[PDB]
From a paper:
LARGE1 (Like-acetylglucosaminyltransferase-1) uniquely synthesizes matriglycan on dystroglycan. Matriglycan is a linear glycan (xylose-β1,3-glucuronate)n, which binds proteins in the extracellular matrix that contain laminin-globular domains and Lassa Fever Virus. LARGE proteins consist of independent xylose and glucuronic acid transferase domains arranged in tandem. Matriglycan on dystroglycan is indispensable for neuromuscular function, brain development, and efficient arenaviral entry.
We first confirm the structural integrity of our LARGE1 construct by light scattering techniques and single particle cryo-EM reconstructions. The tandem Rossmann-like fold of the catalytic domains of LARGE1 was built into the reconstructed volumes. We found that LARGE1dTM forms a dimer in which the active sites on each protomer face opposite directions. The density for prodystroglycan (DAG128-340), however, remains unresolved in the reconstruction, likely due to its dynamic nature, but its presence is implied by density for UDP-glucuronate in both glucuronic acid transferase active sites. We further showed that, whereas LARGE1dTM in isolation cannot bind UDP-glucuronate, the LARGE-prodystroglycan ES complex formed using either wild-type or a T192M variant bound UDP-glucuronic acid. Despite collecting data at zero- and thirty-degree tilt for the ES complex, one of the xylose transferase domains in both apo-LARGE1 and the ES complex remained poorly resolved without imposed symmetry. Interestingly, the residues in LARGE1 which when mutated have the most effect on the matriglycan synthesis map to the region of the xylose transferase domain that remains unresolved. However, despite elucidating the relative positions of the active sites in the reconstructed volumes, which imply that matriglycan is likely polymerized by switching between the orthogonal active sites on different protomers (arrow), we were unable to deduce whether matriglycan is synthesized processively or distributively on dystroglycan and how polymer length is controlled from the LARGE1 cryo-EM reconstructions.
Numbering used by the authors:
A (entry chain A), B (entry chain B): 134 to 279, 287 to 384, 395 to 752
Write the structure that this text describes.
């Protein structure tokens, strides 16, 4: 009843990571038995998938990872032309990689979707007889009908059933190696990668292959002409999207399905105790539900499913080791800023987007449909899926900061447009002020405007002229000047060299710091006191606040978010935010003692 | 295998409508057999549920409605104090209301959630023996332990299994009527409404009751103390939320589940042909997928699940029959306007919100947590659930217009704040201009501002002064003046009486019209040409555009929506919008002929 079903998936890259996320969602939507995933992945995919499954907390799912690079030398001698690359040749060597104590496994591809319970496919293992060990579905295309030799139409490696014990007893490694060498002696190339090799083995030993029903692998490829195979669309099971209305709706069902709905244990089967799940349960049990601020404390320890590098990412290390990454976080309603930011900052960017699955797909379509975003590869998109009622601003900031590729980071905001050439200016400033060997934070002055149509200045003199004419203002000039009052804009107007300032109450500048800067406090959600706590923690750790003369950023106006609108620092939210501020002050007093006394009167 | 399962639900009110939506979602998430819902509902709930199920298009679900008011006289003689009111006493008379050809039924309450397949509960009907006909779960509270007499702890009417044929053969009506009369001779009142009466029958004839397992009705009431009943939380089936962490997560699973995922047919069972579903399938099949504008044409005919009156609504007819309803539509990112609008317009408001299920719950929490929104009952919230990629602005406008309660409607916008007292001014203007007997549209001048902090003028003179100082501008003054150019603001500055204007190219004012105004064209989605087509249709039907002297509205600035940002009338969206404009012009030429020739050069 609770028999563990083992699924082996080969993943490599960010696109493959998204595809395997979709496949795992499809499998979990129909599962009824414990699942053990064996992910053969390179480091790029391994980090993403490990973080995703750690934060996902799916009950009765055990995930293990295997170094795909170590297997490259196993297939480095086989030329390949399939778009999956060398990683497509690794499904042959799974018997060498998977643990020796495993008997049966279901090998899948990243472009597979499940419309039925995977236990039904696992039950097919009971029907194997004789020496049949590879459960394969006959190819639905005329590719092998005349390519690599195959039996009949050939078999498709999109879904495979393997009996590892029998393959190991029969020395599958030597068999497939000899078959591949013999085929490559004349073919000299592979058209469909290891799949072709599979067919070659099927030619030599047809008795090893068990022909599964066609509806276990519905290949929607070009010129498929398989209408008879899926004539009964109601009873279709597994779909393969190998293409370079019901199917579209089914795909969109899982592509936009909420993954947090999968955090429910399997009935009748014990769930293994995970450290993160146990910690979350203990912390939530410690919280008092009678307290009026229960929601905020619950959101503080809430673990959000995080998908690092949601889009393709590339980066090259800086030769001078002084590179700076723009760090910001945003929700969906701020997407219009992104392109503008990409037009101002030419350096690496690390963003944390708080999107739902539907919003994640909308953002993916927007990014793939935008020339500006597709022309830039050094922008890191880390999607933190929505959960709870409040906006985890500090959690998003921590996610963005932790996954940068540069020694220094600028803790900017998505609503702020920087000046042109600020990237090179900060790269020079870190060398000039020697931030590597000192605890110094370089403050970038913040300005705000109320006009959407703005002629962005190309120099500091033009910015001063615009300030004189009343078009621009210092940030929060009309509401709360205490935030940037210690910036000393009056001295900044005529300053030609960076100058040090001192911390004051409610100070919250925008700082360029090192990679190892202390993290934000996750206890603050929504709007208010988010950056004040971080600036206080910076000051208590002996950080020197330095204002640069020739740097500035302008806060473009934005409609109030639902966070502000609902919890506009009034009534229950104001009381809870004051309580959180008091708790943070108490923790500051306890942790550092004498060095943190001056913040009590702040 | 495909046996039809009949579920009887009593619904009354908007809160009950939301609850029954949640219950239906919970039932459909676990169903495996055809479902036939019998909804005993009053007109208020009947309209909402009929529209919701018509737009929902759930396969293998047959919904029928029964007049609950006609049954009131059947229980008008029984005093009741339960918060469900007289509608709570109707479950007794279901045998009188349901069709005589039905044998077995499952009676549910609006506060029920299903965590297991309802076919499992329907299979319990096979286990009935003897004269046991009411499948009930013993009450889990000490309410009946000492109230109305009961057997043991009593039985809970949250979930009932009825054999209608046997009840009719045994004359259940007379039995329960006599039992209720005898009990009320001494009790004189009902504490738990018909439930108490049920228990009384259980006292007289205990052999009629079949005691279901406890986990078929898990009552989470106050002082429940039933930990033993749900000690195995993994294998819990039906939850009753009769209260005035796993349970919370389970409730939020269905409260925020996407209902459009339920539009999948049951495997192995034929689906009945519905007129709306057939029309949608035919229209989508007619559309060419090779056309680059496939998405827009698909969205044109897409049927969106509509939930009329998502919150409690009250209204009183105007004595003079000249009342005007502010009609507007908005998405989530415009919620901050609502309260402001409620501070300006004291009359009835009809709004159409394009929210997802999670966004619907967020809006419900915001509205229940806001004093301004809870103090106003004449605001109609019609939620149109998200589907597709584009914003159905015209569909939302049609939904808002069609469900107003007043003879006249103002086709305003959510981004526009009206002047104080505009409600009474328009109520006087409709009488002054005699819009009842003439085809006249009263134009309200539109202005825009770029400053979020605005001192709203209390008179026209102050508005003129603000215009002179450059603080305010006419709407789209800096971008596209053609939209409100025919408004003739120069004449409006000194005008003291309403004056007629003439239609011009791309004219798009904001008009007060009658209830029977022609609807918007649903072929336009996103942003662009949405109101131009409606104004052209108004002009081609001989509507006189009248500008009022002492009326104005100010367009508060807003961050660009994702619709503008992505499809900012550029590239593919611009081409598709131009194509839609051309098609609308062709339809205008064909439908009216000579009277529509002047729009070709527009
Ligand atoms: O730096 C500051 O001075 C202030 O910045 C924000 O306050 P504010 O800008 O008024 O409010 P938002 O516009 O909601 O916050 C801006 C930042 O939050 C993000 N954001 C986006 C969308 C959303 O709904 N909520 C939200 O907080 C934006 O992407 C951006 O990074 C913080 O919430 C304050 O705690 C802080 O004092
Ligand atoms: O009112 C008008 O005359 C014009 O409104 C919009 O032009 P614009 O104001 O630039 O764009 P929006 O800000 O999208 O229009 C305001 C309306 O759009 C609604 N809205 C809200 C949110 C959203 O995502 N999309 C959207 O269209 C708002 O609720 C409000 O009713 C349309 O693009 C024009 O076709 C229409 O004629
Ligand atoms: Mn901001
Ligand atoms: Mn607008």
């Amino acid at each position: 009843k609770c028999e563990t079903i083992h699924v082996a998936i080969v993943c490599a890259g960010y696109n493959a990571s998204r595809d395997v996320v979709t496949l795992v969602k499809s499998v979990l939507f129909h599962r009824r038995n414990p699942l053990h995933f064996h992910l053969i992945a390179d480091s790029i995919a391994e980090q993403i998938l490990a973080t995703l499954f750690q934060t996902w907390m799916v009950p009765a799912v055990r995930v293990d990872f295997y170094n795909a690079d170590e297997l490259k030398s196993e297939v480095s001698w086989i030329p390949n032309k399939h778009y999956s690359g060398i990683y497509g040749l690794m499904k042959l060597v799974l018997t060498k990689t998977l643990p020796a104590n495993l008997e049966r496994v279901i090998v899948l591809d990243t472009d597979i979707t499940f419309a039925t319970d995977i236990a039904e496919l696992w039950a097919v293992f009971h029907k194997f007889k004789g020496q049949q060990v590879l459960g394969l579905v006959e190819n639905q295309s005329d590719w092998y009908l005349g390519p690599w030799p195959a039996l009949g139409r050939g078999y498709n490696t999109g879904v495979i059933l393997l009996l590892l014990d029998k393959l190991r007893k029969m020395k599958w490694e030597q068999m497939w190696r000899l078959t591949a060498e013999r085929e490559l002696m004349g073919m000299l190339s592979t058209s469909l990668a290891d799949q072709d090799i599979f067919n070659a083995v099927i030619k030599q030993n047809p008795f090893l292959v068990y022909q599964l029903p066609c509806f276990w692998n519905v290949q929607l490829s070009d010129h498929t002409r398989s209408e008879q195979c899926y004539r009964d669309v109601s009873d279709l099971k597994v779909i393969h999207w190998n293409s370079p209305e019901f199917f579209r709706n089914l795909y969109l069902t899982f592509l936009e399905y909420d993954g947090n709905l999968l955090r429910r244990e399997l009935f009748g089967c014990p769930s293994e105790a995970d450290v993160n799940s146990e910690n979350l349960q203990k912390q939530l049990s410690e919280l008092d539900e009678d307290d009026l601020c229960y929601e905020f404390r619950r959101e503080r320890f809430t673990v959000h499913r995080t998908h690092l590098y949601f889009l393709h990412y590339e980066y090259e290390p800086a030769a001078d080791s002084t590179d700076v990454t723009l760090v910001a976080q945003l929700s969906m309603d701020r997407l219009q800023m992104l392109e503008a930011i990409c037009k101002h900052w030419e350096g690496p960017i690390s963003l944390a987007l708080y999107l739902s699955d539907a919003e994640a797909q909308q953002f993916l379509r927007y990014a793939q449909g935008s020339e500006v975003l597709m022309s830039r590869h050094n922008v890191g998109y880390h999607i933190v899926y929505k959960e709870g009622q409040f906006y985890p601003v500090n959690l998003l900031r921590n996610v963005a900061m932790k996954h940068i590729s540069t020694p220094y980071m600028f803790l900017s905001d998505i609503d702020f447009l920087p000046m042109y050439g600020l990237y090179e200016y900060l790269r020079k400033s870190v060398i000039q002020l020697d931030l590597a060997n000192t605890k110094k934070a370089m403050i970038v002055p913040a300005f705000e405007t109320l006009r959407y149509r703005l002629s962005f200045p190309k120099s500091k003199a033009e910015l001063l002229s615009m300030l004189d004419m009343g078009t621009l203002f210092t940030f929060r000039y009309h509401v709360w000047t205490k935030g940037h009052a210690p910036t000393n804009f009056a001295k900044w107007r005529t300053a030609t060299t960076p100058y040090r300032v001192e911390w004051e109450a409610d100070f919250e500048p925008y700082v360029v710091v090192r990679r190892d800067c202390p993290e934000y406090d996750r206890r603050f959600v929504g709007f208010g006191w988010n950056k004040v706590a971080h600036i206080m923690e910076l000051d208590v750790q002996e950080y020197e606040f330095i204002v640069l003369p020739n740097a500035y950023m302008i806060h473009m106006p934005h409609a109030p978010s639902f966070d502000i609108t609902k919890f506009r620092s009034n009534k229950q939210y104001r009381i809870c935010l004051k309580t959180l501020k008091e708790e943070f002050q108490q923790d500051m007093s306890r942790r550092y003692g004498f060095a943190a006394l001056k913040y009590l009167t702040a």
